[PDB]
Design a protein around this nucleic acid. Structure first.
Lengths: 1069, 769
DNA sequence: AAGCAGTAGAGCATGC
DNA sequence: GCATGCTCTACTGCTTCGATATCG
């Protein structure tokens, strides 16, 4: 901690002191080498916590120490006679940073919120800048086996931590250090993690702002993309957003070019060549200043050199010129070096490619650019001199003023152009109604308005503070002036409206897409606040016409084009229902078309956010559908939506029948909202009924052949799926089968319809007949093979949820499904999705599927034990997880180059056995040997892990994945039985080892390694542990003192949920 | 010059002195007329900023600064004058617009008071000052050069401005639209040959060879050699159209009158450019150096006086001697010219504002990689400074300016590569250099031959330099890159009709092609493709000569497991020999038999009985050499070419035999209509628009040839993607009626199934009868 | 030897 | 309390000239 209270040339002695201490206390064999691991931990929380007059050093003053500790160690132990101390102090830095980040629980302004960890932020952002400076150097072999775990923890932790502004920086750092060394030349494991995380971060960032957009974009573009070139169309608006978001915050305007140079050289030259017409014309705000700027002085004015070199060139200028090298000029980058780099990459881009920066030689727009904005010139300004008063015409200034205000890249002219344009718009607005008349005293100027209005928006939400503060009341005041009574439906409001609309339906604009919604909010408030409400009968600004415009927006096959009808509803849901009489006629005729747009969104994109907005669009309406016509469900004359039959009234009762009729759709996210709305639509009738009375009441009127036409849909009534297919035929059938599988699994999950009532031989459905064929294709172009593997593996979890639903509910009695699905095939698919999931099609990369898999495996394996059949399940699982398989897998060579298979095939068995234990039938599959009450598989595992460390040659080393295996393998062997006296007799051990000095007692190391599973196992059977612990307190007092300390502090630590266990431990000791 | 001071405060003092009464006046029009006196061409980048600043400073002496909107919904006068001044000081283009509007405002307000006795004198005074501006300026700044030429052409007295400096000013500041409109406005209100010669010199540089036809007639006194020499450079033929310029130059009779001096300099300058567009680096050097002096001119003070010569004879001198330096032998006679020229100031600014890339290439020749660094960073800053100043809506100026950045950064790449030391001991960066240079060509058909010559000669000089410095089989790897650069240069120089350049490029790329097998095939294919492309405009009996000269080499060895192994090399020889025989047989069958008069072995070569076999053998050999290609191409656009030449040649032979009557050629011809329909329907499937419009040829050849080949239509029409007939659907629902409605039936069924909305409206009229 | 001319070193004032 | 920044004064070495001892 006392490094910035020094002077230079003594700090070398300080760093040599700390290196000498760490070298001396490390070379005596591991009993004491585990305080290196906590001293760096302690110093890290010292200096990552710091936010005659002295000062308060923040965090910059130690980065020279932390480079000294491991970079030039060889030029630090030159005098001190050098094995791996740099290695160890890198591994402990990795471990300590993913342990400081392991317990922070971070669930200033960020985004209308501050509900994270009260003050852990300042101890966090210092850590993120500190690792930005210490991390990215020397990414050698020290970092190669650390990318998997460091990536995986941060994915899993930031997935619950969106708006944190800073959990993507460490991923950018590890991917930069992962393409520094090779490692990306498809080991095939982390690649799928990052490929799948690309789309999730792409859809998450679209609703965000400046610091967090910058964070995600510098993550995304730093993906390698010599190798992630597949779907190169997917992220080019994640590149042209960087340049357009350059020009005011340079460190991503750099990385746009630093990406765009490495894409182009190594991506093969046909999948890139269509993608230049849009990348490049953004790169021409970087050629607009010709060095006419003169701000601060461009000479050497007077300094410590400008006097010392005057009186001859003596030795004091040598003293001064050995003093200006160590300034470490590392302040981002200067703008003019970016302009030179723009020109150098534009030159190196090619010859054919190069001429893309302009129009394309007589397109539609080239011969429209030559034309005046409006023909007759208005805005005649008369500049008063003393005696002349001439006339200077405006409007020749406008296509350079409004082009210069947006993209200037020099703020001293940008603020000038902005102030000029605001006064010019004010003069234009005041000119428009003089007093003379209305054709030559008030001449129209909407050919200027139609190009002045799509630029006030792009100014008023641009980046900068000052222009935003200057254009908020203008863009909010002219809405108030336009939407009026005296206005009487002119032609400029229509231009403003279409400008707002194409502000929403526009690409590369996720800061304006919200501001036009705020304009729609102001439209709807002030358009009824002061209008004549008896006259809103014909104008096309009308909320009827706006809603019809929104519905035509709402049903449209252009992806971004329905997003307007999503977002305008999202921004005036707080309106239009706190005023009545206009909900009931069309907006619940719009609930169905909003769900129809959600049906349309079934094939678009993972990375757009259509789904996440349409769901809120239909959920904002289901909090006012349940407060209005509860008291007003009458037979009025109501307007009729899409698909519905004609009537004279549509009170509540045809919607629920349509909801029942289309529960079989292969639209994955409209079916869910359909069912979820139907269940809470079944009440609130006059009578206040229940879903059990209602569905049986309809079946007694219609019969079971009516409620199987809706569920089976079009899915009742194949060798092209021999190899894995990808056609839209096979995928649509798999989607139909999932629809039929999941449409009534919720009905038997509730108690609406009994399983014997609708699956007995009265419906003649092809359901179990089709599922039996479905279970016969399950294990048998690499582009869209994954497109079908995804739906092949989202069906088996619905099958298992279905049987887990049926076999535990009130339909007990399995006499309906004897050999249809409950045969020797579900007990094949369950076995292969329990153990070895990466051979039927389960990808290893995801998170929200591989965290749901052992849950449903255990929920079903508990649902076959109490069943009227268990023999098939036990005598199928008894063929893989036998004890002899554990014995033959427990080989003799688990150290060295057997890095993946021999120490990965064991871990699947370990996790499978853990989930069997969690079901409750570990012993039925694996009973012990004959005599003793200690399981002779657990004793075998315990002796194996105990003998695994003692050499017999130099040192059996460690890893992270040489300890997660050996700490799952050992947590298994305490779950079998009691097995505790063997544990304490292994701890209190006087056997002597040695290492190349001798200093080893074989119980200290085996305690020191794992040390937490051991104590948590000791704490369970507490009362029969302390007696034989304290009994040998004369001959081995050192070890029992250590074990008693190691149990006392761990019992102290979990005082927050087990307070009445430590009391028992105290009263027993 | 104390107004562009590199220190504020003091600059405010000097401006405060200059803006005072009795040093610069305080009447508005007299202040405007007085502002021209302080021009001083050291400053002109700032001159418009300073002119509008002094002209708008005395705005703040008036009683009119009280609410210039007069109502409640407003703003004050200074809120759009003070930021208007502050934005005019920051950018040139809005400054240009402000000064060019205020100037016209004052001069159109002065016409109330004062008679012509003084306003005519004021306008003649201003005319002399604008001439002085245009004569003295040396750094042609585009929003000033195009500012005075735009306040000129709006007034009636300034129009007679300066037709010989307007041309060379707006030509070198790349603002030719303004000067073209100025001179075409001067030609309105004996003939005026001077302004016509300079206006044609303006149009000659932006292409526009269409509008050099209404200029050079014989009714404005101009000669008859200039029209016939523009009509041979309109088509890119700069080897006769320059050959008759000097034949017009040194002639002695001229019996119509004298060839006036304006036309003499037009002949000189156009002969310079027509020597520039080739690669003759000796005649351009001599014609540019030695039209002022005699017996080894010194050049040293010679060009810098008599100031006509700088804007005309300096660029081609420095370019010709530099390009002759950039390969070959030394002749250190440019370096001393620059070294003696640089002691001045008005020569030290002119030689480094405008050139700097010739300077960098000059100092890299004597291993001064330190001065060259300064000069090339100066050139980059000058490109950026210029490109950001020529206007938005002026295309092709920016394309002609942006076509130089590749040569700039190839210099900058060589500078950063030679001085790093991660190189020059391993050739694993050299391989990356040779594999990134061969994929960075400029585009064919858009980028003219001066730019191709720039890039190729700079690259050959750089490769020779790194072979000099790479003393750590390396002398084959660079020559096998130089070949593939020059070959692409030839294939771009052929497509723009520049044949005299490409012909000597072949003649210089033939001494070492005979030492390999991958080289001779590409050689002979490029040669005999040029010989086909050249024969489109020769009339007759000489194209037979050239396509007979290219016979004895197309049938050489070539199959050293090469033509049998490779497929595209097998396809190209066949299609080119087929087009050769097609050229001969179409040549001597429209003009029958006179062409064997100048013939010794030519007659026997066409014989390889007098007027029947000599056509029949050529047509059947064309059919053989065309039929090899489709079967060698079946195993896009690699099968489409071989298909469509076969379809078009067989259709051509069918329509040639259609207008006559025969039996034997009909017996040969009875295989061709089978070959037409399938080979067109196999290329209509693939997305080809050069064959979709050939559908009524099928729909008529079926009717006229119906005894065979209709199942041959049905089997192919049964599988064609059925939206390639929505154009011809009213052309098929009339063949539905009459006979041979089969092979319409299936496709109409497919369209009525898939898209039952296209055919609904052309079906009612056809079912109506 | 005589003149001079240039730099080393010590003490006051400042900063972290 | 430790490192640096700045001036002035006395020490010290160089250059030129003239006298003295030495070696032929």
């Amino acid at each position: 901690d006392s490094f910035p209270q020094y002077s230079p040339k003594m700090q070398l002695v300080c760093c040599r002191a700390i290196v000498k201490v760490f070298l001396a206390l490390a070379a005596k064999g591991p009993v004491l080498r585990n305080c290196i691991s906590t001293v760096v931990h302690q110093g890290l929380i010292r200096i990552c916590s710091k936010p005659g007059k002295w000062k308060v050093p923040t965090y910059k003053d130690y980065v020279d120490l932390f480079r000294h500790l491991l970079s030039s160690d060889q030029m630090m132990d030159s005098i001190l006679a050098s094995e791996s101390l740099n290695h160890l102090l890198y591994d402990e830095f990795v471990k300590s940073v993913l342990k400081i980040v392991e317990k922070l629980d971070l669930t200033d302004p960020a985004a209308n919120l501050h509900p994270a960890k009260p003050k852990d932020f300042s101890a966090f952002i210092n850590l993120v800048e500190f690792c930005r400076e210490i991390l990215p150097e020397k990414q050698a072999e020290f970092f190669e086996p650390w990318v998997y775990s460091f990536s995986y923890e941060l994915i899993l932790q930031s997935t619950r931590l969106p708006l944190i502004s800073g959990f993507y920086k460490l991923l950018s750092i590890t991917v930069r250090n992962a393409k520094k060394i090779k490692y990306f030349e498809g080991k095939y494991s982390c690649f799928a993690l990052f490929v799948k995380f690309g789309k999730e971060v792409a859809v998450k960032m679209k609703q965000y702002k400046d610091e967090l957009l910058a964070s995600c974009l510098t993550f995304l573009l730093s993906l390698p993309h010599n190798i992630i070139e597949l779907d190169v169309r997917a992220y080019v608006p994640a590149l042209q957003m960087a340049f357009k978001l350059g020009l005011s915050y340079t460190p991503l305007a750099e990385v746009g070019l630093n990406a765009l140079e490495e894409w182009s050289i190594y991506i093969d030259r046909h999948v890139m060549q269509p993608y230049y017409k849009d990348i490049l014309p953004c790169l021409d705000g970087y050629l607009k200043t010709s060095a006419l700027s003169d701000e601060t002085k461009n000479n050497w004015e007077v300094s410590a050199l400008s006097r010392a070199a005057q009186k001859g060139f003596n030795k004091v200028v040598l003293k001064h010129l050995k003093k200006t090298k160590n300034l470490s000029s590392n302040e981002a980058i200067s703008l003019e070096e970016i302009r030179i780099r723009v020109v150098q990459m534009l030159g190196s881009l090619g010859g054919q490619i190069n001429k893309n920066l302009l129009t394309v030689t007589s397109s539609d727009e080239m011969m429209k650019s030559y034309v005046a904005w409006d023909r007759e010139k208005r805005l005649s300004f008369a500049v008063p001199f003393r005696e002349m008063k001439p006339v200077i015409f405006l409007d020749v200034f406008l296509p350079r003023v409004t082009e210069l205000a947006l993209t200037a890249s020099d703020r001293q002219t940008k603020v000038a152009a902005c102030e000029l344009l605001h006064s010019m718009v004010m003069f234009m607005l005041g000119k428009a109604t003089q007093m003379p008349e209305g054709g030559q005293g008030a001449p129209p100027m909407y050919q200027l308005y139609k190009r002045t209005f799509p630029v006030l928006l792009r100014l008023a939400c641009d980046v900068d503070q000052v222009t935003r503060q200057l254009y908020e009341p203008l863009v909010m005041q002219l809405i108030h002036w336009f939407t009026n009574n005296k206005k009487f439906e002119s032609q400029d409001t229509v231009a403003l409206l279409e400008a707002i609309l194409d502000g929403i339906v526009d690409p590369v604009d996720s800061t304006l897409r919200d501001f036009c919604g705020r304009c729609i909010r102001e439209f709807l408030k002030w358009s009824i606040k002061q209008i004549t409400p008896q006259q809103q009968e014909k104008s096309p600004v009308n909320t009827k016409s706006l809603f019809k415009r929104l519905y035509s927006l709402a049903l449209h096959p252009n992806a971004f084009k329905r997003l307007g009808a999503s977002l305008a509803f999202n921004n005036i849901y707080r309106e239009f229902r706190e005023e009545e009489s206009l909900v009931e006629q069309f907006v619940f005729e719009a609930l169905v078309i909003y769900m129809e747009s959600l049906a349309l969104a079934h094939a678009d994109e993972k990375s757009l956010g259509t789904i996440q907005q349409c769901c809120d669009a239909i959920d904002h309406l289901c909090r006012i559908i349940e407060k209005k016509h509860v008291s007003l469900n009458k037979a009025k004359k109501r307007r009729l939506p899409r698909g519905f039959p004609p009537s004279a009234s549509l009170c509540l009762l045809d919607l629920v029948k349509w909801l029942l009729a289309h529960c079989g759709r292969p639209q994955t996210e409209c079916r869910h909202k359909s069912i979820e709305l139907f269940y809470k639509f079944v009440p609130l009738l006059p009578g206040n009924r229940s879903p059990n009375l209602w569905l049986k009441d309809v079946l007694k009127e219609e019969g079971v052949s009516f409620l199987i036409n809706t569920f089976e849909g079009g899915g009742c009534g194949l060798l092209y799926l021999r190899g894995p297919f990808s056609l839209q035929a096979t995928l649509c059938w798999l989607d139909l089968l999932l629809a039929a599988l999941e449409c009534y699994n919720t009905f038997i999950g509730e108690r609406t319809v009994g399983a014997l009532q609708v699956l007995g031989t009265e419906a003649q459905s092809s359901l179990l007949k089709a599922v039996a064929f479905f279970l016969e294709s399950i294990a048998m172009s690499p582009q869209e093979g994954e497109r079908y593997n995804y739906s092949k593996c989202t069906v088996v979890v619905r099958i298992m949820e279905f049987t887990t639903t049926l076999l535990n509910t009130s339909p007990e009695g399995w006499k309906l499904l004897k050999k249809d699905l409950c045969n020797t095939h579900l007990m094949r698919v369950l076995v292969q999705t329990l153990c070895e999931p990466a051979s039927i099609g389960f990808n290893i990369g995801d998170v929200q599927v591989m965290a749901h898999l052992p849950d449903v495996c255990v929920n079903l394996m508990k649902a076959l034990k109490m069943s009227p059949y268990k023999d098939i399940l036990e005598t199928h699982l008894r063929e893989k997880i036998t004890a002899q398989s554990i014995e033959e897998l427990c080989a003799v060579n688990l150290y060295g180059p057997d890095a993946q298979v021999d120490r990965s095939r064991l871990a699947a068995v370990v996790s499978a056995c853990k989930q069997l234990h969690r079901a409750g039938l570990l012993h039925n599959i694996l009973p012990s040997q004959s005599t003793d009450l200690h399981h002779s598989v657990g004793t075998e595992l315990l002796s194996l892990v105990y003998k695994g460390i003692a050499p017999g040659q130099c040192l059996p080393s460690l890893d992270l994945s040489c300890k997660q295996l050996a700490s799952g393998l050992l947590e298994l062997a305490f779950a079998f039985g009691g097995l505790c006296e063997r544990l304490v007799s292994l701890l209190l051990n006087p056997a002597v080892l040695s290492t190349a000095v001798i200093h080893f007692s074989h119980g200290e190391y085996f305690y020191s390694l794992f040390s937490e599973t051991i104590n948590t196992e000791l704490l369970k059977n507490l009362d029969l542990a302390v007696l034989e612990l304290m009994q040998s307190s004369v001959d081995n007092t050192k070890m029992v003192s250590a074990v008693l300390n190691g149990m006392l502090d761990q019992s102290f630590r979990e005082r927050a949920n087990q307070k009445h266990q430590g009391l028992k431990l105290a009263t027993t000791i | 010059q104390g107004l562009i001071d590199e220190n504020p405060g003091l600059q405010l003092i000097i401006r405060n002195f200059w803006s005072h009464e009795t040093r610069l006046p305080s009447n508005t029009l007299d202040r405007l007329l007085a502002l021209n006196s302080l021009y001083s061409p050291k400053i002109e980048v700032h001159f418009l900023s300073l002119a509008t600043n002094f002209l708008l400073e005395m705005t703040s002496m008036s009683p009119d600064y009280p609410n210039p909107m007069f109502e409640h919904p407003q703003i004050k006068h200074s809120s759009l004058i003070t930021p208007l001044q502050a934005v005019a000081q920051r950018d040139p283009i809005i400054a240009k617009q402000l000064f060019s509007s205020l100037f016209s405002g004052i001069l159109k307000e002065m016409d109330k008071f004062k008679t012509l006795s003084e306003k005519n004198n004021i306008t003649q005074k201003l005319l002399q000052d604008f001439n002085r501006f245009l004569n003295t300026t040396f750094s042609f700044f585009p929003p000033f050069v195009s500012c005075i030429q735009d306040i000129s052409c709006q007034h009636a007295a300034l129009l007679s401005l300066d037709p010989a400096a307007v041309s060379a000013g707006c030509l070198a500041s790349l603002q030719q639209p303004v000067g073209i409109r100025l001179l075409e406005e001067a030609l309105l209100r004996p003939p005026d040959v001077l302004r016509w010669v300079e206006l044609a010199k303006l149009y000659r540089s932006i292409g526009e060879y269409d509008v050099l036809r209404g200029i050079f007639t014989s009714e404005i006194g101009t000669k008859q050699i200039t029209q016939s020499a523009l009509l041979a450079e309109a088509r890119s033929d700069y080897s006769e159209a320059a050959k008759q310029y000097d034949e017009a130059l040194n002639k002695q009779d001229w019996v119509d009158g004298e060839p006036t001096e304006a036309e003499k300099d037009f002949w000189e300058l156009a002969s310079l450019d027509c020597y520039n567009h080739l690669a003759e680096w000796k005649s351009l050097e001599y014609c540019s150096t030695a039209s002022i002096d005699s017996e080894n001119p010194p050049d040293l003070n010679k060009i810098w006086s008599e100031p006509f010569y700088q804007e005309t004879y300096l660029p081609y001198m420095i370019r010709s001697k530099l390009k002759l330096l950039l390969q070959g032998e030394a002749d250190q006679s440019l370096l001393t010219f620059i070294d003696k020229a640089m002691h001045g100031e008005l020569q030290k600014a002119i030689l480094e504002l405008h050139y700097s890339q010739e300077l960098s290439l000059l100092y890299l020749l004597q291993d001064d990689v330190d001065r060259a660094k300064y000069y090339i960073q100066n050139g980059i800053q000058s490109f950026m400074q210029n490109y950001s100043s020529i206007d938005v809506l002026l295309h092709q100026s920016r394309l002609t300016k942006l076509q130089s950045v590749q040569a700039l950064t190839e210099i900058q790449e060589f500078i950063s590569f030679i001085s790093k030391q991660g190189n020059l001991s391993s050739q694993v960066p050299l391989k990356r250099l040779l594999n990134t240079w061969t994929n960075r060509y400029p585009d064919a058909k858009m980028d003219p031959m001066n730019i191709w010559d720039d890039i190729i000669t700079n690259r050959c000089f750089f490769l020779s330099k790194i072979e000099e410095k790479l003393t750590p089989d390396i002398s084959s790897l660079i020559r096998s890159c130089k070949f593939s650069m020059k070959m692409k240069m030839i294939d771009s120089a052929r497509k723009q009709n520049n044949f005299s350049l490409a012909m000597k490029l072949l003649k210089e790329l033939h001494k070492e092609s005979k030492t390999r097998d991958d080289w001779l095939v590409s050689w002979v294919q490029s040669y005999c493709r040029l010989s086909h492309c050249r024969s489109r405009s020769q009339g007759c009996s000489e194209q037979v000569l050239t396509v007979l000269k290219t016979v004895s080499l197309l049938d050489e060895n070539n199959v050293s497991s090469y033509l049998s192994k490779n497929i595209l090399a097998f396809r190209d020889q066949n299609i080119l020999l087929g087009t050769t025989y097609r050229i001969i047989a179409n040549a001597l069958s429209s003009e029958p038999a006179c062409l064997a008069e100048i013939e010794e072995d030519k007659a026997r070569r066409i014989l390889e009985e007098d007027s029947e076999k000599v056509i029949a053998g050529l047509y059947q050999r064309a059919f053989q050499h065309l039929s090899e290609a489709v079967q060698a191409a079946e195993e896009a656009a690699g099968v489409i070419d071989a298909y469509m030449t076969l379809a078009d040649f067989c259709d051509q032979q069918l329509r040639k035999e259609e207008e006559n009557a025969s039996v034997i050629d009909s017996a040969e011809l009875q295989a061709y209509p089978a070959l037409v329909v399938e080979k067109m329907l196999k290329a209509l499937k693939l997305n080809s628009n050069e064959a979709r419009l050939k559908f009524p040829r099928l729909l008529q050849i079926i009717e006229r040839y119906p005894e065979e080949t209709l199942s041959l239509m049905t089997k192919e029409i049964s599988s064609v993607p059925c939206w390639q007939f929505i154009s011809w659907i009213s052309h098929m629902v009339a063949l539905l009626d009459k006979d041979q409605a089969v092979a319409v039936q299936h496709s109409v069924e497919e369209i009525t199934d898939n898209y039952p909305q296209a055919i609904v409206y052309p079906f009612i009229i056809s079912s109506e009868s």
